Homo-oligomer: A and B are copies of this chain.
Amino acid sequence: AWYARYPHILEEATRLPFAYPIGQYYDTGYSVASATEWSKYVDTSLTIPGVMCVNFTPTPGESYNKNSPINIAAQNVYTYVRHMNSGHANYEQADLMMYLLAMDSLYIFHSYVRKILAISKLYTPVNKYFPRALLVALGVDPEDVFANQAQWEYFVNMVAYRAGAFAAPASMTYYERHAWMSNGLYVDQDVTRAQIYMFKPTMLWKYENLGTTGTKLVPLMMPKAGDNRKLVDFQVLFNNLVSTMLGDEDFGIMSGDVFKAFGADGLVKLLAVDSTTMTLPTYDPLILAQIHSARAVGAPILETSTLTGFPGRQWQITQNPDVNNGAIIFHPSFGYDGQDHEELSFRAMCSNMILNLPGEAHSAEMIIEATRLATMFQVKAVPAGDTSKPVLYLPNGFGTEVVNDYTMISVDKATPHDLTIHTFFNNILVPNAKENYVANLELLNNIIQFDWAPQLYLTYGIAQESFGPFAQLNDWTILTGETLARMHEVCVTSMFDVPQ
């Protein structure tokens, strides 16, 4: 060949600088020097996004009866605590189970602040997003972690010490699943300049035992991305979390009874951190499998949230013993977008989802673990009133965690190329504006930069027509709501299961 005869000309001809370090703006330049008269018609910008954050919410699953897996697990752990290990008989099954859920929220908070501490020591020349973009996506000021890192470390250690006052079973996979999910960095590819997936809890459950009418886990809001929160705000959040937890007699005898039934080696163990413990991003395909099938349900509903025609639709877990035979009722109203309007794009999520999977042959565990974060709407919630500004949807069942939002961190194409935060569901609405089509195209390109990005459903407001899954398909199926509800029931039963 000619290439074998003259390899020197081929070598000197094709020496190009590869491996551009992502994290800053790049300008391609002009091939035509007279193209400056067409200013916006030539796109010389080139931005590579680096961080996608999955804003998740811990849930016990769908529950409207006593036949829910949460109530079955409550009855089983109550039998193991009292009827086999001599309990105190000052509480029911549901009080113990809501106490266990409060433990889950505590361990999620500890893994969250441990990830916040461990992220800030990551520095590399090939990625300029490390570690400021991850701290921006977590809603924490990076200067407050640069300046007082030792205070952050000792606060994390003190959280791990104070969380050991109560007890929780180690063999329950719910705790270790939430702690592993909330404390990981997951690259979308096995390359040195990959993109970071993340899991930030926006919801934490706060114990609210007031009155005789039963306990309740009220919502507690976590810092959203772009809010520069310091260590004092996280300490205030932690003290608000254990305000009604420590100093409670019922919680004290519950911790004593769990410490009696399960041994000292049978309880969970929060690991101590120090100055040499840092985490690196790992490649997890099973994380990408459930990230791909993740379906957003929108921002949660609080007591302060105003809804026209929807009163009392807050995301609370109730423990009223006078109604429903004292069941742990938790079924929320989805589709709320954070404010009081119609949110036309959420109608695109009313079709049956497409379960996409890598490879050709799929095991049962792969299909079950790929549908952990999926949620399909089933029936519209009937409003109590003649006028209704939003539209809410009741699901047919969800897993141990739902997805509310997503967060994109990428460099801006305009001066001075700082980080931009883009919050979006799977559904993206593009209304009548000349500045919204190019922004939506840039958001689409930034989404498809990631490998297993969730399947979007873009609604165009000027054509009154939405679009299906905007993702590349390899081996897919159509999932009905009944089969996904069955898989969610299996997942919630297996996660809350404890061995006796």
Q: Is the CB of B380 within 8 A of A32?
A: yes
Residue A487, interface by CB 8 Å: yes
Q: Is the CB of A241 within 8 A of B352?
A: no
Q: Is the CB of A139 within 8 A of B276?
A: no
Residue A403, interface by CB 8 Å: no
Q: Is the CB of A149 within 8 A of B140?
A: no
Q: Is the CB of B278 within 8 A of A122?
A: yes
Q: Is the CB of B362 within 8 A of A45?
A: no
Binary B-proximity of A126-167 (CB < 8 A = 1, otherwise 0): 101000000011111101101111111111111111111110
Q: Is the CB of B86 within 8 A of A260?
A: yes
CB nearest neighbor in B for A100:
B258
Chain B nearest CB, measured from A442 CB (Å): 7
B153, B166, B352: which contacts A245 (Cβ < 8 A)? B166
Q: Is the CB of B109 within 8 A of A241?
A: yes
Counting chain B CB atoms within 10 Å of each CB, the highest count among A138, A242, A435 belongs to: A242
CB nearest neighbor in B for A144:
B230
What are the residues of chain B within 8 A of A347 when measuring CB–CB? 35, 38, 41-42
Knowing A152-B231, A354-B28, say if A246 contacts B165 (CB, 8 Å): yes
- A sample of 25 inter-chain contacts (CB < 8 A) reads A5-B499, A13-B364, A21-B252, A26-B478, A31-B350, A31-B377, A33-B379, A35-B347, A43-B457, A43-B465, A81-B258, A88-B253, A90-B250, A95-B250, A109-B241, A110-B270, A118-B277, A128-B252, A139-B228, A149-B154, A166-B254, A272-B275, A444-B444, A445-B467, A449-B472
Chain B nearest CB, measured from A361 CB (Å): 9
Chain A residues numbered 6-54 whose CB sits less than 8 Å from any CB in chain B: 6-21, 23-36, 38-46, 48
Knowing A9-B19, A350-B35, A479-B16, say if A150 contacts B149 (CB, 8 Å): no
Knowing A29-B480, A480-B29, say if A19 contacts B189 (CB, 8 Å): no
Knowing A42-B351, A81-B261, A466-B40, say if A21 contacts B253 (CB, 8 Å): yes
Residue A490, interface by CB 8 Å: yes
Residue A305, interface by CB 8 Å: no
Residue A348, interface by CB 8 Å: yes
Q: Is the CB of B31 within 8 A of A30?
A: no
Q: Is the CB of B125 within 8 A of A252?
A: yes
Residue A321, interface by CB 8 Å: no
What are the residues of chain B within 8 A of A38 when measuring CB–CB? 347, 350
Chain B nearest CB, measured from A491 CB (Å): 9
Q: Is the CB of A191 within 8 A of B123?
A: no
Chain B nearest CB, measured from A67 CB (Å): 7
Q: Is the CB of A438 within 8 A of B457?
A: no
Residue A302, interface by CB 8 Å: no
Chain A residues numbered 455-495 whose CB sits less than 8 Å from any CB in chain B: 457-460, 462-470, 472-483, 486-487, 490, 493-495
Knowing A30-B351, A268-B107, A379-B33, say if A41 contacts B125 (CB, 8 Å): no
Residue A388, interface by CB 8 Å: no
CB nearest neighbor in B for A445:
B470
Q: Is the CB of B114 within 8 A of A32?
A: no
Q: Is the CB of B40 within 8 A of A463?
A: yes
Q: A20-B478, A23-B67, A41-B464 are in contact. List 19 more A-B contacts (CB 8 A).
A: A2-B497, A3-B365, A19-B256, A20-B477, A20-B486, A21-B256, A24-B252, A29-B478, A29-B482, A31-B396, A39-B464, A106-B241, A106-B245, A109-B237, A109-B238, A116-B234, A126-B256, A156-B273, A166-B245
What are the residues of chain B within 8 A of A441 when measuring CB–CB? 458, 460, 467, 470
Chain-B contact segment, one of A206-214, A218-226, A307-315: A218-226
CB nearest neighbor in B for A84:
B261
Chain B nearest CB, measured from A250 CB (Å): 6
Binary B-proximity of A437-454 (CB < 8 A = 1, otherwise 0): 110011011001101000
Residue A113, interface by CB 8 Å: yes
Closest 10 A/B residue pairs (Cβ): A139-B223, A150-B154, A12-B19, A125-B255, A141-B228, A40-B465, A2-B494, A21-B256, A85-B261, A160-B270
Residue A284, interface by CB 8 Å: no
Knowing A2-B497, A140-B223, A238-B159, say if A35 contacts B351 (CB, 8 Å): yes
Q: Is the CB of B437 within 8 A of A125?
A: no
Q: Is the CB of A13 within 8 A of B490?
A: yes
Knowing A81-B257, A223-B140, A357-B18, say if A40 contacts B250 (CB, 8 Å): no
Residue A180, interface by CB 8 Å: no
Q: Is the CB of B30 within 8 A of A19?
A: no
What are the residues of chain B within 8 A of A90 when measuring CB–CB? 250, 253
